[PDB]
Amino acid sequence: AIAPVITIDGPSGAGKGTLCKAMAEALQWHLLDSGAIYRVLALAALHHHVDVASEDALVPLASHLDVRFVSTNGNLEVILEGEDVSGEIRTQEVANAASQVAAFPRVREALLRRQRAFRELPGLIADGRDMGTVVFPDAPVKIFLDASSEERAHRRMLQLQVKGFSVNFERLLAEIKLVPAADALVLDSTTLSIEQVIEKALQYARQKLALA
């Protein structure tokens, strides 16, 4: 604390990205995508020639990571050391190095400290899986976003089509077929439209942080 943090946790394909981008743009606050964080670290290592298997070399790199997330019209730019690398981060190769980097206990602890460092004024929207339970347990507004398998399977299908792969809906529904904080507002992405979820999330934030 001091600066307010709104945390958004939930499973893959629930629409957290969309929500987090809409809220950061509406409020004009800082943005943190914890899912992208390990991929950015793996890319910096590749870029600097830091050995992906060396926990000792990766810790200082993680603790000093120069990244920022900017959302414009729903488009996320991932700026690493000043250059946009949003495209680079979506590769399988970077996803694979990210898994190697994440295996080490000291690297995960260094990234835990690095992510808490994003909490600045006027505030922060943070999205991930353990944002409200582990990274920012004291957050004033905590939202857990749930969605049906079909909703999640559809979101994955569009995500992959983007990289070029169009895959059978039934196949993905099979492929897809994380504890909310005690103090989280639970919102269901399938009972409400995504536009309705964003309105409902912004109203709850307002009641807790502003209004009157």
In angstroms, the CA 59 to CA 52 distance is: 11
C-beta of residue 55 within 8 angstroms of C-beta of residue 150: no
Quickly tell me which residue has 């964080």 as its tokens. Answer: 37
Structural domains of the chain, ranges and CATH numbers in brackets: 1-212 (3.40.50.300)
Q: Annotated binding residue at 74?
A: no
Q: Annotated binding residue at 205?
A: no
The residue among 128, 158, 145, 154 whose CA lies nearest residue 189 is 145
Q: Annotated binding residue at 14?
A: yes
The tokens of 198 are what? Answer: 């964003």
What resolution, expressed in A, was reported for this entry? 1.8
C-beta pairs of 95-101 under 8 Å, 24+ apart in sequence: 95/39, 97/42, 97/43, 97/45, 97/46, 97/52, 98/38, 98/39, 98/41, 98/42, 100/42, 100/52, 100/53, 101/38, 101/41, 101/42, 101/45, 101/52, 101/58
Which method resolved this structure? X-ray
Neighbours of 113 (CB within 10 A): 10
Q: Annotated binding residue at 191?
A: no
Q: Which amino acid is at 65?
A: L
C-beta of residue 101 within 8 angstroms of C-beta of residue 38: yes
Q: Annotated binding residue at 164?
A: no
Q: For 25, phi and psi rounded to 5 degrees?
A: -75, -45
Q: Annotated binding residue at 122?
A: no
Q: Annotated binding residue at 140?
A: no
**Residues in CB range of 102: below 8 A, 6 or more apart:** 38, 108
Helix (H, G, I), strand (E, B) or coil at 71: strand
In angstroms, the CA 202 to CA 1 distance is: 21
In angstroms, the CA 122 to CA 5 distance is: 9
